Amino acid sequence: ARVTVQDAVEKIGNRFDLVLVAARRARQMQVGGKDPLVPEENDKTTVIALREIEEGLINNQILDVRERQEQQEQEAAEL
């Protein structure tokens, strides 16, 4: 459940990059098959990604680092 996202807009510079990174995370979770770092309460991926970015463990730099780690481990498996 979620009513307002002010606790998300205070930690990010604005709302546009916020919604962009949150939609990227929700897409990586839905069709990418990623485990949500925050437990779900029978909710859609939207509120899950909102709570993720709200806690502070998922941001733009964090998402970039995660994507880079994914790329490097894929290429290490590819040798």
Place this chain on the structure above:
Amino acid sequence: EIKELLKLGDLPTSGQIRLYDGRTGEQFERPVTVGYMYMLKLNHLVDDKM
């Protein structure tokens, strides 16, 4: 004229009768007025709008 017509009946002169709530079953202070009003159903029902 309306006052004397109400006086002809057993209805109060002021036209406001104390009403009891159906949910909780208490008395409504400031006696609400209640009467008979003629009303109309307009030709703007929901079955041709939704």
Place this chain on the structure above:
Amino acid sequence: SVTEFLKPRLVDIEQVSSTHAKVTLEPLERGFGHTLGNALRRILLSSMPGCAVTEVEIDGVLHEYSTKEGVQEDILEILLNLKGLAVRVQGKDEVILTLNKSGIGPVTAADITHDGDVEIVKPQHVICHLTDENASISMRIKVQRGRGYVPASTRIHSEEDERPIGRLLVDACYSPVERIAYNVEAARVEQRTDLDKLVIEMETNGTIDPEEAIRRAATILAEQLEAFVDLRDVR
């Protein structure tokens, strides 16, 4: 005493008429008066076992949006009048009655072919007015006992049931009570003060019995209260 006081008891079913009845529940210590009054009023107005009509069948008329040579009123007024009719069934839950009449005159509920378990509360309830001498009416009327109220739209299940054109539907408004008012007063206890006695007046269709209706309402309320009389963490 200070704890474990008494419980009320039914003492009067004094009926000022065949339908307008009055009961006097007594005694009540304090505060229980308005509580029980509102509770019983809401239970009676919400759900009571009714025995109204649910479906009719007339051979002459096909659909309620037509007329019939011989009757003064239209089929819609006939349906409204038979919906306003009240009847009591005892043995079965659903029944089919047959009403056949002829000749000029106001035909009422008395002219129907009653049965043993079927009881007409008031034969003076006019049904139709046959305004022709060589005119006859023959109708089938389905009456089922249920709980609450259901309109004529959602009562249907499939179009295969209402395929007979003669089978016409009407909203089954089966609710015997019409109005239930109540007032608390100072009970006449033998040796005590500020006891409450609740006088409940009821205007109804005369079908249900006042004491029986009160007992049924109290039973429903007690069964609903039993839900959390032993409430615990259960799913």
Place this chain on the structure above:
Amino acid sequence: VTEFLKPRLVDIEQVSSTHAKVTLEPLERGFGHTLGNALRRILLSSMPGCAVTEVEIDGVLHEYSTKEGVQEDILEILLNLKGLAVRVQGKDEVILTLNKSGIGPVTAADITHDGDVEIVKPQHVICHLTDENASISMRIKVQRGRGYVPASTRIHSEEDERPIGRLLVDACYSPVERIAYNVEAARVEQRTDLDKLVIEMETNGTIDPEEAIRRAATILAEQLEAFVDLRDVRQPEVKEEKPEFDPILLRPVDDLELTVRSANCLKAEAIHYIGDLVQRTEVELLKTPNLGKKSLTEIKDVLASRGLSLGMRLENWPPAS
């Protein structure tokens, strides 16, 4: 079917161990409102308990006063002691003493721990005392009432006699502090919408809120026992006898959905009762005057289609007329 629905709770929230929230779902179309109202009016007014009802200060015997040694006024003392929740055993009236001095404030922990009473919150502050040279003492008489009583009625009951003069407070015999019920819409797979009840309550702490709900339920059950069907079903008994004569035969022949000409030519044979016509085979029909093929077809179809037969052998007729 005259069979209602029993709710199934899905949330008993016991936050703060003294402020509970119960949910119930689903109910009838309007059962939630009446249930909430009845439970509220029961728990507020008719819910017995134990609380302070008389106070007597051995230094001040007046409502208005300026008692030294304390920075709280006498009205503040009464306000503090009114909320002092205590639990007493079967003894419906008992007094307690609070003779105490010291530096800090006197609280509920300084109450004499008698074997017949118990304090639920000893750390509840009662009176902030002056650090130096402040000797205050008072007694409190508690009773076992039914609910909330105002100050005016208590002052009047004192005005009855008041031989020595007794300081009084707003006694709160209701163990519940507050309660509020709210009805909302509840979805059912087939039903349109039902009542979902949410009752948030908070008590003095002497009893669990669910215990207070159970007590209200059992008191309402005791009140309604005298009217609940006199039993579970009131009729675990069946009796289906069989008469030696069919009631359809008692009714006249004119009640067989037949035409007027058929009834006329049947009355011409002086046959009016179905019990008299059942003893009339077809041999008399084709010989009866004014009986062709349509009238015979009617008198054989609309007569025997009701389960009976045209021509049968009975003897008990007519019982008893």
Place this chain on the structure above:
Amino acid sequence: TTIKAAKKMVEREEAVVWDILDEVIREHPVLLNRAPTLHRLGIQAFEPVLIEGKAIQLHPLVCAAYNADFDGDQMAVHVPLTLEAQLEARALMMSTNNILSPANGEPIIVPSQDVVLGLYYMTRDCVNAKGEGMVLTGPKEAERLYR
């Protein structure tokens, strides 16, 4: 199994389809819109709750943002149909995130006539009534005494 089976199911209107609807409209906000949209508040986002009937139930206060009365107005409703669009409607176009007018910093959440009249009646005090001049210990006890 197939799309035709699902279509036959949803047209049959059984009971196992209602919980699916409650699940899919659990956190999927829709976009409500007034017929004339002078400013941005004419279009807002709302979490839908299933009601029985044929009309659209709306919060009483938010109508002041649309200047929409209940004399027969007709509002439109749309769906985002996109993860990005749903998330944006939840983030920006939501009614909770839009409380101040774009013209003035004053809230557009000003109460209407009913609630202000109720609160005025609740706050307006007389000189002599039941319980006059007594003392109470808290707001809960006051509410209990009033009930």
Place this chain on the structure above:
Amino acid sequence: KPLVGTGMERAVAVDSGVTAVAKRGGVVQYVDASRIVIKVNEDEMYPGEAGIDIYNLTKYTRSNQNTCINQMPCVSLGEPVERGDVLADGPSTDLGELAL
């Protein structure tokens, strides 16, 4: 019927063409939900080749606004009617009075 009337309700229901007005007074001979038969009184009957009036009520039929328009009788047998009086209440009428 509207309780709080304005007096004009007795005219709008008659001056319109939705109510079957009695062209010639008389006694209602044959009542029916579909038709009405009026026996003309001898005072105003035609002195040569006269008869009875037959008012054919219109049943539930489509209107210009898809609104059900229908006329219903309001008199019984033997009830004498006057010339210009109402015979059958039309749509939204009650005993020769506009009932909106």
